[PDB]
Structures are given as structure tokens and as C-alpha cells.
Paper text:
The use of cyanuric acid hydrolase to solve this societal problem is being explored and the best candidate for this biotechnological application is the thermostable enzyme from [name]. Consistent with the “Toblerone fold” observed for these enzymes, the RMCAH monomer is composed of three concatenated, highly divergent, but structurally homologous domains, which endows the enzyme monomer an internal pseudo-three-fold symmetry (Domains 1, 2). As observed for AtzD and ACAH, the active site of RMCAH lies on the pseudo-three-fold axis within each monomer and is formed by similar sets of residues from all three domains. As observed for ACAH and AtzD, each of the three serine γO atoms is in close proximity to a lysine residue (Lys40, Lys161 and Lys299), generating three pairs of Ser-Lys dyads each from one of the three isostructural domains from the same monomer.
The X-ray crystal structure of the engineered Moorella cyanuric acid hydrolase was determined by molecular replacement and refined to 1.51 Å resolution. All four monomers within the RMCAH tetramer showed clear electron density for a bound ligand in the active site, regardless of whether or not substrate/inhibitor was added during crystallization. The ligand was readily interpreted as malonate, which is a major component of tascimate used in the crystallization condition, and no residual mFo-DFc density was left after further refinement. All four MLA molecules adopt a staggered conformation, in contrast to the planar/eclipsed conformation seen in AtzF. The top-view of MLA shows that the MLA-protein interactions mimic the substrate analogue barbiturate (BAR)-protein interactions at A and B carbonyl-binding sites. The forth oxygen atom is far out of the plane, occupying the position D, (position D) and roughly points to the center of the triangle formed by Ser (83, 231 and 347) γO atoms and is within hydrogen-bonding distance from all three Ser γO atoms. The triangle formed by the three Ser (83, 231 and 347) γO atoms is slightly expanded compared to that in structures with the position D unoccupied. The electron density map clearly reveals one metal ion bound in domain 3 of each monomer in the MLA bound crystals, interacting with the δO of Glu301 carboxyl group, one water molecule, and the carbonyl oxygen atoms of Ala350, Gln353, Pro355, and Gly358. The octahedral coordination is consistent with the presence of Ca2+ in this site.
Author numbering:
A (entry chain C), B (entry chain B): 0 to 283, 289 to 367
C (entry chain D), D (entry chain A): 1 to 283, 289 to 367
The structure:
Amino acid sequence: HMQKVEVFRIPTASPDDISGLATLIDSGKINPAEIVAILGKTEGNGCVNDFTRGFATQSLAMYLAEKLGISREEVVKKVAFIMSGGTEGVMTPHITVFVRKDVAAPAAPGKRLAVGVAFTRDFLPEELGRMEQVNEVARAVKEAMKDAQIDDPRDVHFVQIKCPLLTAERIEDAKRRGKDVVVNDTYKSMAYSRGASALGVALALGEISADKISNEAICHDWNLYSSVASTSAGVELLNDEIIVVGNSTNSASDLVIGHSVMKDAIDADAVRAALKDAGIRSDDEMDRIVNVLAKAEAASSGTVRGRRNTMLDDSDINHTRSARAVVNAVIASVVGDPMVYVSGGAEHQGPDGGGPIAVIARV
Amino acid sequence: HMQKVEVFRIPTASPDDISGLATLIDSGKINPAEIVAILGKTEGNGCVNDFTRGFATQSLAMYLAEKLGISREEVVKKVAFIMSGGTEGVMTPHITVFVRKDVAAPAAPGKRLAVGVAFTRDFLPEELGRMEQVNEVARAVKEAMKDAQIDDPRDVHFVQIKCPLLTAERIEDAKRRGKDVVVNDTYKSMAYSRGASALGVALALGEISADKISNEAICHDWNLYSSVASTSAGVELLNDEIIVVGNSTNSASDLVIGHSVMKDAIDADAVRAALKDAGIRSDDEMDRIVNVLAKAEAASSGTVRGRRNTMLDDSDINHTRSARAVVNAVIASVVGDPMVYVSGGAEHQGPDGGGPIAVIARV
Amino acid sequence: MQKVEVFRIPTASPDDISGLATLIDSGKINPAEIVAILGKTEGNGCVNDFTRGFATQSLAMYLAEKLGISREEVVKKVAFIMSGGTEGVMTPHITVFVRKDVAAPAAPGKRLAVGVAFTRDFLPEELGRMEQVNEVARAVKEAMKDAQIDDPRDVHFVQIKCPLLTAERIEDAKRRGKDVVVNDTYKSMAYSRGASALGVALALGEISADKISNEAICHDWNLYSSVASTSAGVELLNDEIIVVGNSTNSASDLVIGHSVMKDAIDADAVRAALKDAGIRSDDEMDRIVNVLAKAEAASSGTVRGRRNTMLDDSDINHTRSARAVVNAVIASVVGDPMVYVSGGAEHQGPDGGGPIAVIARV
Amino acid sequence: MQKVEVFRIPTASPDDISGLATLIDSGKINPAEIVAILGKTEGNGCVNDFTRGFATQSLAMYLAEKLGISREEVVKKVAFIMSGGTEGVMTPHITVFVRKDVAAPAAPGKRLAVGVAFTRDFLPEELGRMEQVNEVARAVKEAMKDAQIDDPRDVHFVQIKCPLLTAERIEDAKRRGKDVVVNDTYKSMAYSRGASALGVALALGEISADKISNEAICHDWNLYSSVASTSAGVELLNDEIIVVGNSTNSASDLVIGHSVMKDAIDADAVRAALKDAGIRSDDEMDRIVNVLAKAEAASSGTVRGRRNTMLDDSDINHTRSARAVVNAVIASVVGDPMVYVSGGAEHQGPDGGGPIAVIARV
Ligand SMILES: [Ca+2]
Ligand SMILES: [Ca+2]
Ligand SMILES: [Ca+2]
Ligand SMILES: [Ca+2]
Ligand SMILES: [Cl-]
């Protein structure tokens, strides 16, 4: 069972811009029936009140439903739509479209890019940031691995998740139902949803043993983390959507993925290590990049390499916005291109203050 | 001898503007040795990273030290400096200067304005938002009442407090010392400091019995509140400073204070009730206003009179900023003047979504 | 006979159509008779506010599918004016205008009437200039006819959506060798709003044409309309006009009245607008359908002699602050923060003030 | 013979003088030899940033008390340039310049030299206009003399603090019958920065006087200085100038070099500036005293053909975003986010770029 994955990084002019995707479909380069996932950077604030994420998904679902002659509801059941808000600094809004199809092809000369998709059930507000979310995410990650035809967790290089958050109305509704939520704070709820989801990845991949994970460890024990999880929260969904990206011997793709882990927000060495892991060994081979995907965050200590910063004290600009600008700038300075995927808030994703970074590259 | 309190509401051009106070001192209207407290609205963001509060205090302490021929340290030991940041909407930056004269003259008939000042000990970071802060504030409020020569809590109409907050550096240092702080969030720490301080007022005044107050109730049980507490947090101090304002039979002041409680952020009726309680019975009598002092906040329900608002969901503008703009605008529309004191974050200060409102008026 | 019905509907998010769908499914609203929807959407109300477009897309998709027509036809048939920015306590909502033909006598006197017109698309270099003024003026007169209002004194509110400049549009104009009115995205909203407002004043006879030139736009604050309400967005390239007034040829059980806020804290003008709409005492406040107002920071940096930081605050843009203030003032008078307040009142009321209208049940 | 010593000191808050006090109390700094302090302070770096003034007041009060002189005399003697905005990972700090007269001989080649000069106060209506250009140019020449630098090729960084407009100052100008360069407080910072930078270019011969006019300021991006670094603030009414370069008549154990970032992600220019200061490999990075750079949003709204939102974002002003980006780029090259990055680079390097200098131990 050979599958071919193709990946298209498409600049966008606004959250609702489908024109670049339409161009690739109209020219025959993309059969829209073979799209399995779209990962976006959308130009809202990336925090609670970011409606560019939902706007982008609605616009893509409308377009694809009408191209395929099916309902928007069926498109959303069939295709993962993960919109990561926040395009701070020089970060360029874009979408990354994953196309997958069965092919009649012989055995790869090694392992090549593979992608799998799985969705969880919807969560009650009082399940976010708790073991209910951890365990359901872990189940879905294992399902997505099977979908990708990856049996060895060491061949998984990036697990991208969209997960829910709490709004004031959802917290108050939980209160009226007699239920207490993990945190009575809309912005901080994103951290708990991101972190519980990341711990689900680590559980599913065997990066952390189950006996170490409990409600009390979530967003507290930073010794527990996944080296490939990348999680992103939004008002526009009530479940978790999972994209597993790795390499498989059952892949006929002309692409590979590699990764490293940024030890902190300015770790350009880790960017170069991720490039090398994807087969890019010199600046001359940089044109083989399809995209770079990374997590960024403010370290809980309030410092980087012992130097204070204000990210956790700044009441005007939220810390995930600042972290995204910084890490996108670092990556852009290495690869010469700010149109790369950077997502903020890296709870249990790499060490405290760091985050996984993956590169999808042409062979 | 006999206390006489005079109160001067002075517009400012910037946080460091001492010119209006200097004009009143140079004219002989204010003897600087008789200043006991200054309550400011300063034009920073009113949140964690607001340095206009400390800048204003430093500028006033420098100026008064040089006028009095004493050290800045002595001025700060002797005079309360309470700088409430955040001048959103049309709210006009200003300071309110409290002068206490000792006069060999009769008391005025009835009860007239009286002011008392007390400072607590410094608090360790791990004490903010907990019973150590509640109980020490209650002790100091009783001391300030004695300083004001008010022996009946019913004659206390406004208790204004400045209290500390947590920064990322202070939280990390607490962690290094093996201590758990009340909340691992700088902005939310302001709410816990404000709320514990307000409960200390309620305890001291007999508004709430001690047996109802515990660490678990702080910033949770909104049935517990003071009807006169007004608390404000800042990076620029490590203790609580307290100004008790009320009326005393042993006073020669030509001023009185009255108050009410806003039931919600748009309760103009409560503004008019506070004016009436201070002897202002018609629009023509509003020229007797010296200042209006009020607390404002976002209700935990995310609504006002059943109508949703975004204050608790908005990741760009923090909720205390929004609440200050709203309540200042409401008061300004009643009294015709936006140069009034409005402070945001009213945990245990009036009901959830409301806050105390006092008026100092000429007789 | 014309009969206008108006529904103020709370929304849970920019894309929330549930309240409108409830009214349609119950038979209160025939979707074919909707002529305009005026929204407050919870984005920042400035340049990078996509809640306006998200709301319009969601409503157009819902109505297109209910009516069995294309979204393109819906947007030609219905004015969608989405005013972003729900600061302070201001409650997100939509106001739906329904116009029916009824076989009943016109009501005594004058009753609510509405008209809609659209302009052509504008080139970036036309925004904030006489091209926009004159084309809006033509559309306003067209919308007056649509409303069957002959006397401009019977127009009480003219709501407009107009375009703005983004960095990409400015750069494209540069590449084409064309200078724009201002090389500033946020300020371009002011020029678009102001030129559109002067178009209203021109069409209504509030200001004679000889007084208006490119040089006076966003400069001569003596020139203003007392009924114009303009709002800018990235989501359109033309101007959309809703004229609201009263006509003798109307059978609506609603009326509209208005006043002008002299400044951002002018509660007296709120009460005057209520009275102009027939609400003369507090106990009649439940006859409000909605209140619609413009708010702005005064160029002097003061209100009633008192400084504020609106024009100096680099964190929060001045139209956000003005909306929070004026919504709070109105809410404190009427007891309800779910009213329409739009910021940036260039040539709309005096400098620092803005028109305020009340649609009320008779 | 002049010897310049430079101390980069982390700060805990805008008013933190403890690190400087420690260097004085240990005998490493004689406070009477301080000639300039260049700070990064943690306010927003825009109009309503009072951390800059708070930092200057705190340092002037500390130094006045240590020296037994008045604060007023300290401010007449020492340049205090506080650049607000510490976005991203940028670490608040101050850089203290100490100049000693020493009997030592002629150190081989050229070594670090510093000079200081102040302009007169400007009226608000003078900001962004030729009067500011010309007065700054005269002060830059005076500062070069103070530094004992006669050749403009030996000037590597000219750091300036300059004024801005607030609403109150604009109203003052209007009351006096004057118009200001722009009726926009945030944009006024760009005009003050840009006019000041053109004054540097004029003084250094980087542009000819006949090419500079009021109309060119903040419009002709072909006119720029490759060493000017300008920063605006509410806390002063004049321009303060620090010229940093190398002189044959210097005994400093430090040198300065520079390059120009072509855009906000130009790490090659960071490396070039390091190499120009004698740092030839990653293992010599420990010789850095500080890195000083200008950052800005390009007028095109793009970096290397890729769109960004810096000029469209109504929540976060573009100089805040540019500072975060360029500090992150420099930090990733040198391994330390405690470097000086200032935003808004009008006529400082190309459009979208800015000068970058390195002070390094020999
Ligand atoms: Ca992490
Ligand atoms: Ca309260
Ligand atoms: Ca106006
Ligand atoms: Ca430049
Ligand atoms: Cl109570």
C-alpha cells in the first residue's frame, strides 16, 4: 500500500484568500479530492478573540465543497483544517496544503514523507486541560499514525494539533451546570488545552510513560514534554484535530521531513539541525525547503540565556504573540524567508522556553 | 488640636507633572508639611508594566523633599502615595492632594471630612492574595481609622489602598526559594492582591465576619465584599498603603464625604445616590464636587444586564482597562467632568461587576 | 404601501446567524424582504478587522441558501454594513431592516422609511477625495428615492460603509504612479469616512458644493452633516448607503428621530434623540428598537476642558476608545449596552461629537 | 589622550541604578568621567512611553547625589538617551560611556572615541523640518570635534534622542498661529527621527544640502545616513547627539565597526558589522561590548517579496514589531538578546533596513 504525499506552501492575501489554492487546482497540479489537511497561518492575534482562524476554515470549506460538489459538512469531516492565528513580526500569512493519494509504485529508496489525520470527539469545557483530553488525544494520535502507515514512533517528526479553548460564556455556562473548569481564565485556558494535547502526543509516542501524567502535572511539570508535538488552540472548534507527519517505507513521496528541538527562542543551531535532518546540508540546498514548522514560547523563568525579558510582564502584548515574532525572525534569518509556520505557546512541547522544529524538504 | 482636611484635585500634564501642586504651595494655599496623602490617576496602562505610578511618586517625593528640606525617604515614610494607573477613554490624569491642618478652632457642627493613613509591613510574594495580607491590612485599616479620629465604621465612606503585585522575576525567585505563590500569572496576581486587601477592609470595618474568610474564599466567593474598599495594585511598592476617608464629629473641615455602590458598570443611579449622600441634591449643586472616586470591573458572567461583552475574552486589551473607560464615561456623563478617579478591578469591592463610589463635596 | 420592520438581534460571534434564523423559521421575517443588515462585530474596528468580512460572508451564505440564490445576488440585493469594534460593554449584535409592501393605508403623519444604494468601486487614489464625495452624494439621493423621502429634513440617519487603504493597496498605487490621499492605513479610514460624510451633507443640502474641495476634507471641521454615520473596512471597495428617515407614504409602526452629541459625554443629546423619536420619559424606554450613534476623539485632545490620552495613546487607537466611551454613556441612559456605536466622526457632527438616532416603536 | 570605557549593564526596571552603583562602588567607574548613557527602557517605545523619562530622572538624581552637584548640572554635562521598547526577547539595559584623559602614548592605529553635543530646544512646529535638520547637523559636527574625529569615514554610529508631538503640544502650536509637520503624534516621531537622521547625513557628507528640503523628509528614501540612529521621546525638547567612532588620538582598548542591514532579517549584515569591529569568528563573540542597531517596517509591506502585517496592524505599532524582529535576528547571531535595537529607521539605512554597529574589545 504505497501512498504519495505532496505539500504546497501558498501565500495568502487575507484569511479568506483561496486564490492560490484555486490556481493550483485549476492548473491540474492539485486534485482537490486528494487534499487531506490544510495548515494555515492566519493574520488575527492568535489568542482568544481571533476569528481569522474560523474565517479561513469557512472560506476554504466553502470553496472545496463547491469544487467537489459536496456539502461543507462533509468537507469538514474529510479534511483537517488547522488554522494557527498570529502573524507577528515579519511572519507571512500562508497555508500549507497536504495532498495524499494511493499510487501504484515500487518500494521507496528508504523512507519518504507520510501524513495521517485523526479527529477526537468534542470536549466539554471542564475536560480541557485534564486527563480526558490527554487520553482522547493519545488515542487519536495512534489512529493518525496508522493512517500515515508509520509503526515506529521514531519515524514521526511533527504532530500538529488544533485544540479548543474557554471563553467567558463557556466558563459561565460550566458554572451554571455545577462544573469547575481547569482555569478561570480565557487566555490561560489555551495553555492548558495546548499542554494536555501535547502530553497526549507524548503518551501515544512513548516519549513519556503514563504513570507520570496526571491532572496535577499538566502545565506544571516542564520535565515532561514531547519533542515533536505542536499544538494550537482556537475558539472555532470543540474537539482536537491531529495531523501526524513523518516518514514511511510505504511512501512514494518526493519529500522527506526532519526535525530538531529549539532549546530556547534564539536557538538558530536547532534550525540548522532540523534542516540537516531533512537533507539540507548547505545554504545552496535551501531551495529544497517546502516549509519550516516550529513552536515558540516565553520561558517561565522570564529570561533567555539569563537575560530578562518582559514577555510575561507585558500587559499590552500577550506572550504568545511576542514569542511567535521572535522565533519566526530567527528562522527567517537562517532560511532567508519569513513565510514559515511558527506557533506560540509550547507547553510540554520541547523544554520550557523551547519547542520542536521540523522541516519538510524536497529530496 | 482640631483636624481640618482640605482636598485639592489637580490636573496633570504627565506622570511627573508637579506644576499644579507647586502653584498651590507657592500661593500659600497648601503648606507642604501638612500633606498627608496624594491619590493619583496616572496615564500608564494600569496593569503590571505600568511605570507611570512609580514615576509619579518619585517626582512628587523629590519635589516635596526639596521643598521641606528633608530626604525623599522621610517623605515616603510620612506621606501616602497611591498612584492608580490607567486613564482610558476620556478619563483625565490628575492628583488629589489631602492636606490635614491642626487648627486651634472649634469643630464644625455635625460630622465633617476626616482622613487617616496607615502603612502595612512589606509582604513576601507568597503572602499576596492570602490571609497574611487580609489580616495585616485589617490591622492597618483600624490604625488608619484611629488616625482619622473615626470610631464608628459607619462613618467610613472610602478606604483607598495601594497594594503589591507579582512579576515574573518575583515568581521565579519564590520558586527558587521553594515557595508557591497564590497564582503563577502576573496580571491575575493584581486581582488577588486587590481582593485580599479589600477583604481586609471588610474585616476591619465589620462588614464581614472573620469566620467567613479563608484563602479558598479569596477571589472566589463574590458574596463577600466591602461597600467602601477601593484597592489598586502596582509594581512600585512591596506593602499596602491605606487612606481611610470618612466623617468625624472632631473635624473642622468644610468638606464631607458620602458614598453608594454601583450595582454594575452602567449604574448611573448609584452615581446620583453617592452625590446625594454627599449633600449634592441637584445638578446646580454639582459645583460643590471636589472629586468622585469609584471602582469599576468586568463581571465574571461576561455580561451586563444580560448583554454579552468581550471584556474577559479580548486578548488585546485587558479587562481592567475596559472597565475603567466605561465607568469613567458613565460618571463623567452624570457630573459633566471626566476628571474623576476610577480604578479597575473590584474583587470583593461591591458586588461582582460593581464597585463602591464616593463623592467628596464642599458643604 | 411601504412598511419597515426592524429587528435588533444579539450575536454570539461574528458568524452567528442563529438569532436571524429563529426569526425566519418562526415566520417573523420573510428573508426575501430583508433590505439591509447593520452589524456591530467584535473585531478591533480598525484596519485589520476581519470580523466584518466574516460576518458578511456568514450572513450572505445563510441567506443565499435560504433564498435559493447565489451569494453574489444576495450581496447585490442587501446592504451588509458591519461596523467593527465592540469595546467596553458594547454588545455585539445585528440590526435587520425588513421592508414589505402592505395592502393597508399609510399611517397618519410620517413613519419609518428606508432606502439603499451602492456606489461604484473606487481606485485607491480616489479615496478621501472629491471622486468619493460626489459618487456618495449621488448614491444618497438614489437611496432617498428608494425610501420615498422627498424632503431632506425627514432623513434622520445615513449609514455608510466605505473602503480603506492597506499597505498592499498603497504600494500598488505607487507602482502605478498614483499618489494616495495619505500613506497611512489607519488614517486612510478617516479620509474615507470623512469624504463619505461630506457626500451625505452635499446630497442633503446641509453644505453647498462650493464649500467642498479635496483641501477641506479632514481639515475644515466647520463642515459637517448632522445625520451622516460612516464606517470603513477592508472588506469592500465601494460605498454602501442606507438612508433612514420618515415618509408620509409609510405604514411602519416605527419612527426615527435624532439629535447630535456635542461631545463624547453628552447624555443630554441622547435624551434629546429619544424625545425626537417619541420617547419622552424613562418608562417609555422599552419602545427602543435600537440607538445608533457616532463617536470620536476631539482634535483638541480634551473634553470639556479636560485632557485625555486618546490621541497620545500608542497602544489603543482613538476610535476604539471613543466607541467604548459613547457606548457607555448611551447605555447608562437607556439601561442597555446593546446599541450601535461607530467611531471616527469626521464631518459627522462637530469635532468631538457625532449624530445619534433612535428607532422607536410608536 | 582620551580613553573611552563602555559598560553594558542589565537593569531590573527603568529606575534601576543598582548595576551602575555597583561599578562605581567597586572603583571601576569614576562617575565624574561618565559622558553618556544609552538605555533600552521597557515602555512601549512610542508616544506614551514614560519609562524613558523615569530612567533619565533616576540616573540624573543618582549621579547628582554621587557627584555633589544639581540634577540640572548633570543633565547639562551627560547625554541621557533612553530608547523605549523592549519587545520580544530584548533585554532592558543601559550602556555607560566613560571618557578619561590619560597620559598614555598613541595607541597603534585608531581606537574608540566618543563625543557629545546638544541642540537648542525646538518649538513643536519645527519638528520634521529643515530647522531640525540644520541644527542637528551643526551639533553632529560639534560632537565630532568633542570626539577628536576629523574624518567622517571614522564615524561608525551617531546616536540621537529627539522630540515628538503630543496633542497638547499641537494645540499649543495652533494657539500660537503655527502648523505642525503632521497632526499625528505617532507619525510625528517618524518626522523627528527622519529630520534628525538627515542632519547626520548632511554633517557627514553622506548627502548634499541641495538635495534636502521639507518635502523630501520622510518621502525620499534614497536619502539616508549609513551610521545615524535616531530615537524620539516625550521627555526632551531638543536633540542630544552621541558620535561614536575611532580616532588616532585614542588610548581605548575598544574599537567600533559597522554595517547596514539591508532588511529586517539580514543576518549577513550582523556578521559584517562584527567583522568590521575585529570579531572574525564565533569564538571571538565574547569581545562584544554591545551591538547597536536600527530596525523598521519597510514601506512596501514586504520582506524579500513576502507580505507582513506590520503596517496594517492596528493593535501593535510597527516600530514595536520591527524592534522584536531585529533584536531576535541579532540575538540569534551573537547568542545574547541584551543588545540595543531601536525602531523607526527613516533616512537611516535603506527603506526597511538600518545601520548596525558593534563595540568590541581589541
Ligand atoms: Ca516548550
Ligand atoms: Ca466588585
Ligand atoms: Ca464629528
Ligand atoms: Ca531605513
Ligand atoms: Cl456584603
